[PDB]
Copies of this chain bind each other. A is one copy, B any other.
Amino acid sequence: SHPISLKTLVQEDDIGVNAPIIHQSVIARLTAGLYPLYQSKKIPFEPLPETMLTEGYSSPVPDVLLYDHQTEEAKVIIEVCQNSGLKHDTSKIVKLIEDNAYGILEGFVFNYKTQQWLRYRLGDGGVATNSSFSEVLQVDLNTFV
């Protein structure tokens, strides 16, 4: 199990200067947790951290994405809040999914301070819900953090 829980890291971050470390730790946790499912062929998409969707200056760069090498598209994206709001950042992922540019089917936002998750699925009319379950991957993403 994790040598240091997210709860402990958050409890110890009195001045808030550890936020970047905690954020990258979540990225590490998700990437490391998902990777063996990919290598074992349980999931078809490669987990990739901090990967640009395009070469544009303004390209989105999701904290974690699930990449389909065959179609050259990200199918699931995960954003970890960092000194930012869960709700705010979710309104952002919804637009990314509903504008249909990138082939993204599902998105998540995780607030590491409260360990709360929001999910959005393409086709859900712009309304997000409180879920950590990926229907694309068939896994509970909260299990990895």
Q: Give the number of times this chain occurs in the complex, counting copies.
A: 2
- The answer to whether B32 and A36 touch across the interface, beta carbons within 8 angstroms, is yes
> Taking chain A's interface residues, is the majority helix, strand, or loop, or is none over half, making it mixed?
mixed
Q: Which of A44-52, A83-91, A102-110, A118-126 lies at the interface with chain B?
A: A44-52
Looking at the complex, which one of B28, B39, B67 makes contact with A47 (CB distance below 8 Å)? B28
- The answer to whether A51 and B21 touch across the interface, beta carbons within 8 angstroms, is yes
**A35: interface (CB < 8 Å):** yes
A47 nearest CB neighbor, chain B only: B28
Size band of the interface chain A makes with B: 20 to 34
Residues on the B chain within 8 Å of A27, using CB = 48-50
Looking at the complex, which one of B2, B46, B48, B67 makes contact with A39 (CB distance below 8 Å)? B2
Rank and list the top 9 A-B pairs by shortest CB-CB distance, nearest first.
Answer: A32-B35, A24-B51, A24-B48, A32-B32, A49-B49, A31-B31, A20-B52, A28-B31, A50-B50
User: 7 new A-B pairs (CB below 8 Å) besides A25-B46, A32-B36?
Assistant: A3-B38, A17-B55, A20-B55, A28-B46, A28-B48, A29-B35, A50-B50
